[PDB]
Design an enzyme around this catalytic site. Structure first.
Site, mmCIF file in Angstrom:
data_model
loop_
_atom_site.group_PDB
_atom_site.id
_atom_site.type_symbol
_atom_site.label_atom_id
_atom_site.label_comp_id
_atom_site.label_asym_id
_atom_site.label_seq_id
_atom_site.Cartn_x
_atom_site.Cartn_y
_atom_site.Cartn_z
ATOM 1 N N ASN A 9 0.860 -1.170 0.000
ATOM 2 C CA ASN A 9 0.000 0.000 0.000
ATOM 3 C C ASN A 9 0.898 1.222 0.000
ATOM 4 O O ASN A 9 2.117 1.110 0.178
ATOM 5 C CB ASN A 9 -0.937 -0.008 1.221
ATOM 6 C CG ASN A 9 -0.204 -0.220 2.530
ATOM 7 O OD1 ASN A 9 0.432 0.690 3.051
ATOM 8 N ND2 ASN A 9 -0.289 -1.430 3.065
ATOM 9 N N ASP A 12 2.476 -9.070 1.866
ATOM 10 C CA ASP A 12 3.192 -8.249 2.843
ATOM 11 C C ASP A 12 3.169 -8.902 4.223
ATOM 12 O O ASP A 12 4.131 -8.806 4.985
ATOM 13 C CB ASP A 12 2.585 -6.841 2.938
ATOM 14 C CG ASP A 12 3.072 -5.912 1.832
ATOM 15 O OD1 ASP A 12 4.142 -6.183 1.254
ATOM 16 O OD2 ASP A 12 2.397 -4.900 1.557
ATOM 17 N N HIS A 40 9.558 -2.583 -2.692
ATOM 18 C CA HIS A 40 8.214 -2.161 -2.302
ATOM 19 C C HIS A 40 7.518 -1.439 -3.445
ATOM 20 O O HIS A 40 7.936 -0.360 -3.863
ATOM 21 C CB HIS A 40 8.309 -1.245 -1.070
ATOM 22 C CG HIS A 40 6.986 -0.900 -0.456
ATOM 23 N ND1 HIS A 40 6.503 0.389 -0.393
ATOM 24 C CD2 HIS A 40 6.025 -1.688 0.081
ATOM 25 C CE1 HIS A 40 5.300 0.379 0.153
ATOM 26 N NE2 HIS A 40 4.986 -0.870 0.448
HETATM 27 N N1 APR Z 1 1.991 -16.112 2.093
HETATM 28 C C1 APR Z 1 1.849 -15.988 0.765
HETATM 29 N N2 APR Z 1 2.707 -16.700 -0.078
HETATM 30 C C2 APR Z 1 2.567 -16.579 -1.455
HETATM 31 N N3 APR Z 1 1.683 -15.849 -2.101
HETATM 32 C C3 APR Z 1 0.844 -15.152 -1.232
HETATM 33 C C4 APR Z 1 0.846 -15.166 0.152
HETATM 34 N N4 APR Z 1 -0.154 -14.334 0.658
HETATM 35 C C5 APR Z 1 -0.755 -13.830 -0.419
HETATM 36 N N5 APR Z 1 -0.186 -14.294 -1.583
HETATM 37 C C6 APR Z 1 -0.496 -14.016 -2.991
HETATM 38 O O1 APR Z 1 0.162 -12.845 -3.401
HETATM 39 C C7 APR Z 1 -0.644 -12.075 -4.347
HETATM 40 C C8 APR Z 1 -0.704 -10.611 -3.948
HETATM 41 O O2 APR Z 1 -1.913 -10.238 -3.258
HETATM 42 P P1 APR Z 1 -1.813 -9.096 -2.124
HETATM 43 O O3 APR Z 1 -0.758 -9.411 -1.149
HETATM 44 O O4 APR Z 1 -3.098 -8.981 -1.426
HETATM 45 O O5 APR Z 1 -1.451 -7.820 -2.945
HETATM 46 P P2 APR Z 1 -2.214 -6.999 -4.134
HETATM 47 O O6 APR Z 1 -1.702 -5.774 -4.752
HETATM 48 O O7 APR Z 1 -3.662 -7.292 -4.307
HETATM 49 O O8 APR Z 1 -2.644 -6.130 -2.846
HETATM 50 C C9 APR Z 1 -1.660 -5.411 -2.041
HETATM 51 C C10 APR Z 1 -2.355 -4.735 -0.888
HETATM 52 O O9 APR Z 1 -2.931 -5.764 -0.048
HETATM 53 C C11 APR Z 1 -2.430 -5.621 1.257
HETATM 54 O O10 APR Z 1 -2.354 -6.926 1.893
HETATM 55 C C12 APR Z 1 -1.081 -5.007 1.044
HETATM 56 O O11 APR Z 1 -0.471 -4.385 2.209
HETATM 57 C C13 APR Z 1 -1.454 -3.938 0.039
HETATM 58 O O12 APR Z 1 -2.113 -2.804 0.646
HETATM 59 C C14 APR Z 1 -1.973 -12.840 -4.492
HETATM 60 O O13 APR Z 1 -2.037 -13.445 -5.795
HETATM 61 C C15 APR Z 1 -1.948 -13.801 -3.271
HETATM 62 O O14 APR Z 1 -2.618 -15.048 -3.534
HETATM 63 NA NA NA Z 2 1.026 -7.382 0.019
#
Ligand code: APR
Ligand code: NA
Ligand code: APR
Ligand code: NA
Lengths: 249, 249
Positions: free
Chosen positions: A54, A64, A115
């Protein structure tokens, strides 16, 4: 030279990666934590992890969160946010956090976290089916392109999860395609001039601006076997990436 | 300390700037060229110019065109694009080009151009009245915030035109408001903690995510005279910036 590791717990994301991408690149269906544990039976290697976050650097969810757990929880998050200047970073930006400072928390061969904010805050998805281009294809490509452009040249491997495919709410079918395209440009190396890559991006994102299509790039498409007509009409929702970057390249 | 000069040929933009902004800042209705000519009867001073451009660094239109003319035309554009690595820079990025290298083209007291892509290419407006927030308020704020964050600390003045108000097609009434907000945060200096500014941005952009609103910032709002209820419901289309950053500050 540099190994690229696509890691994600969503098999839909990993399956789609398998389909849109032709060693130098590895795909791992599973938790980042296990890939890290797995990363201790090879070199008997420094990596960078791309993390979609984020605009504020909080690590409370998604990928994250795995980073949060793995690197020291709430003191690490506190340190992490300070490395980012403790302030707002726009979507479209990318900041490398050097974990080397752990020696002042060190773990495995991970030295960097790239990041890349994908959402201002996870209060709602960024995706809107009314325009999958401006809210899906484009933001994912930008995030992937920046992560790649910001990848330290000293690392052995780059770990990347699905981008915008979690809290951002972008369908994997859309995200994986843009990630595949960004990666395909990067892996084309010097086989395609920087200017032509610029043109391919421009049309991939559906900004058909002729004045930004130099004659030298037109000559390069003819030489590379790229159909210019299909380039000028590339439709990200229906056309294969192959039409922009032929695998023969 | 640092003077901020808002310059624009559209009187609607300059008029709106007058209304939404409280010496340290100057507004000039007119061509950049004349402001530069005018910039030769004062110091008998180094500046940076923010330029809203495209993702490729071409300077064929709008404000960029004034820069193109003023700094050497097509050789300058060629040099400029090379300073940017000759490649795609995402909207949401900001790159400082040091003109000092002119000594290897030098002119006036301008040493820097802060290149902030506002459009991938000017093939169509980025604005969509269906969502003035995601296509107007937000992109303009991000571009202004990045330009300010990237402003070299060594300059005497910062020249900035309306952002996204030309080829990007964002209505001045929307752009000026986000520019005014970004500038108001910057001019608040340390009178508002970085964290609170983060919170004000988050609500200004309508991402009401409570977990990202620390208790310390709530205590700071009470101390600063900021109504928390109105903060949590800030509506960028109807509420005054004053509700976020009281002028009494
Ligand atoms: N432990 C994990 N290991 C591997 N892959 C993971 C894990 N947790 C989540 N993922 C995968 O990583 C990808 C990224 O999703 P997000 O982490 O939710 O990120 P995206 O841009 O949608 O969203 C980022 C936003 O979400 C918040 O959690 C983060 O701080 C930010 O604000 C997804 O395809 C998800 O399945
Ligand atoms: Na994330
Ligand atoms: N010579 C000039 N002097 C002062 N102000 C000017 C001048 N020319 C244009 N402006 C003003 O600067 C503002 C910025 O408009 P644009 O330059 O068109 O930029 P905006 O983000 O819309 O669009 C940038 C996009 O347009 C292309 O020309 C540019 O390369 C980029 O792709 C507008 O409010 C416009 O009135
Ligand atoms: Na311009």
């Amino acid at each position: 030279k540099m190994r690229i590791i696509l890691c994600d717990t969503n098999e839909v994301v990993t399956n789609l990666w398998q389909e849109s991408i032709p060693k130098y690149l590895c795909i791992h269906h599973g938790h980042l934590q296990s890939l890290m544990d797995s990363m201790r039976k090879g070199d008997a290697h420094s990596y960078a992890i791309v993390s979609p976050g984020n605009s504020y650097g909080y690590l409370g969810g998604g990928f994250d969160k795995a980073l949060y757990n793995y690197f020291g929880g709430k003191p690490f998050e506190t340190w992490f946010r300070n490395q980012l200047g403790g302030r707002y970073h726009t979507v479209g930006s990318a900041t490398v956090v050097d974990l080397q400072r752990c020696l002042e928390e060190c773990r495995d061969g991970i030295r960097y976290i790239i990041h890349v904010p994908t959402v201002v805050a996870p209060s709602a998805p960024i995706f809107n089916p009314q325009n999958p281009l401006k809210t899906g294809f484009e933001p994912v490509f930008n995030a992937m392109w920046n992560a790649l452009m910001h990848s330290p040249k000293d690392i052995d491997g780059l770990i990347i999860p699905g981008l915008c495919t979690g809290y951002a709410g972008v369908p994997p079918i859309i995200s994986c395609k843009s990630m595949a395209f960004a990666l395909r440009l990067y892996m084309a190396g010097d086989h395609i001039s920087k200017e032509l890559k610029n043109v391919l991006i421009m049309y991939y994102l559906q900004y058909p601006f002729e004045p930004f299509f130099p004659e030298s790039c037109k000559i390069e498409c003819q030489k590379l076997g790229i159909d210019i007509e299909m380039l000028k009409s590339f439709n990200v929702e229906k056309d294969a990436i192959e039409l922009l970057i032929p695998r023969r390249i």
